[PDB]
Each structure stands twice: as C-alpha cells, then as structure tokens.
Amino acid sequence: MAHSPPGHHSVTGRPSVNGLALAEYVIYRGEQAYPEYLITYQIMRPE
Amino acid sequence: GTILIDLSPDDKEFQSVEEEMQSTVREHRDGGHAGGIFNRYNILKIQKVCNKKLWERYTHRRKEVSEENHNHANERMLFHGSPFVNAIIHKGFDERHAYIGGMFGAGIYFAENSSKSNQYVYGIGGGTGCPVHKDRSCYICHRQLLFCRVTLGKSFLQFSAM
Numbered sequence: 001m002a003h004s005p006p007g008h009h010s011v012t013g014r015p016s017v018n019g020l021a022l023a024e025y026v027i028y029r030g031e032q033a034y035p036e037y038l039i040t041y042q043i044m045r046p047e
Numbered sequence: 048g049t050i051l052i053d054l055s056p057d058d059k060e061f062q063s064v065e066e067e068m069q070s071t072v073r074e075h076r077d078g079g080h081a082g083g084i085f086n087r088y089n090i091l092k093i094q095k096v097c098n099k100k101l102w103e104r105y106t107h108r109r110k111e112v113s114e115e116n117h118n119h120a121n122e123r124m125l126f127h128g129s130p131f132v133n134a135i136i137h138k139g140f141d142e143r144h145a146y147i148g149g150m151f152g153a154g155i156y157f158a159e160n161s162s163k164s165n166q167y168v169y170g171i172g173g174g175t176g177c178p179v180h181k182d183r184s185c186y187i188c189h190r191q192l193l194f195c196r197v198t199l200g201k202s203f204l205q206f207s208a209m
C-alpha cells in the first residue's frame with residue numbers, strides 16, 4: 001500500500017466536471033474502516 | 048468471530064440504511080456499462096456486521112487519528128463494493144483490499160454514491176458481470192454491498208476531473 005500525504009489520514013476526491021457526482025475517498029490503513037452493514041440487493045430495470 | 052444480525056424491514060435502522068442506498072443512486076458517464084442501467088434498487092436484506100476484535104481495531108485507530116486532528120475523527124458512512132465482501136466481513140480491510148490502479152494511489156476506496164460502489168461488485172469496471180449470466184446489468188442475480196464506518200481524519204483534497 002501507499003501512504004496518505006504527509007500530515008494527512010486520507011484523500012478526498014471531488015468531482016470538478018460532473019456537478020451531480022458525489023465524493024470518493026481513499027484510506028491507506030485497513031483499521032480506518034469497519035464493514036458495518038452488509039446489504040443484499042438487485043438493481044431494478046427502469047420502467 | 049463475525050456474527051451477522053438480520054434487520055427487520057420494520058426496523059428504523061433497516062429503513063435509514065435502505066434510504067442511504069436509494070438516495071445516492073446517480074447516472075454514470077459510462078451509460079451503465081460497468082454497473083448496469085437502473086434508477087433504484089430492490090433491497091432484499093440488510094445485516095449488521097458484529098465482530099468485537101475488528102471493531103476494537105477500528106476504534107483504537109479512530110482515537111489515534113482523532114488526537115492527531117484537533118480531536119476530530121472525521122468519521123463518515125461510505126459504500127464499498129468488492130468481489131471480496133465475504134473476506135472483508137470476517138477478516139477486515141487490509142492491504143489485499145487496496146486498488147493499485149486507483150486514481151489516488153494504492154489505497155482502499157469508498158463512495159458516497161451507492162451506484163459508484165455498485166460498479167465494483169463484480170470487479171474492476173464491472174468485470175464480466177454476474178457469474179451466472181456474464182451480465183454487468185443483470186436484474187436477476189443478487190448483489191452485495193458494504194455500508195462502512197470510515198475514519199478520514201485530516202483529508203487531502205484532490206480536485207479530479209470526475
């Protein structure tokens with residue numbers, strides 16, 4: 001794995017083109033996330 | 048060590064997690080190529096993931112981060128799609144869950160858009176789609192996502208052409 005930039009703990013990627021997209025995030029230590037909910041689902045065909 | 052507790056659809060906690068799934072769907076610039084074409088999900092089951100060891104691993108690091116960031120963990124709830132969801136819930140995130148070809152380096156990636164994480168349930172770029180039909184837009188096969196608790200601490204802001 002890589003490291004977060006010095007003095008940081010993560011990276012926030014903000015969309016500068018698509019105004020409708022939300023942020024994506026990166027961490028570099030697995031102990032900084034907990035997998036709290038497991039969601040089972042189907043995608044739905046548009047009507 | 049991992050226990051999975053089914054939530055009832057009548058439980059308030061089920062309903063708020065479903066609404067986070069549903070309200071963060073968006074259209075993607077690939078036209079649905081990687082994740083499928085949809086505006087919303089059929090949510091079949093929501094389970095709470097309980098593992099004392101993994102949880103104490105999380106809260107121990109959260110306190111270190113918080114103390115290096117003016118007492119602010121900067122904790123979010125974020126989605127994560129992966130073929131390795133089953134390994135993740137029993138063993139936790141580690142460096143084998145890091146995306147080498149990721150846009151911000153070799154780390155573990157999360158999304159606020161559920162439909163973004165949906166693009167990775169069958170692999171990078173949707174892989175070859177579902178195991179049964181090889182269909183990245185399969186409306187039949189059941190999929191799984193993780194809704195995760197994530198400590199960001201001091202976060203480096205990257206303005207990506209996304």
Ligand SMILES: CN1C(=O)C2(CCN(c3nc4c(c(=O)[nH]3)CCCC4)CC2)c2ccccc21
Pocket residue numbers: 024025126127128129130143144145146147156157158163164165167169170171
């Ligand atoms: C190690 N490995 C990975 O890490 C992924 C799965 C998880 N991946 C991921 N990437 C993103 C988002 C997300 O939920 N999951 C949302 C935000 C944007 C990017 C990255 C790729 C993978 C697929 C196939 C084989 C190996 C791997």
Ligand SMILES: [Zn+2]
Pocket residue numbers: 177178179180181182185186187188
């Ligand atoms: Zn299928």
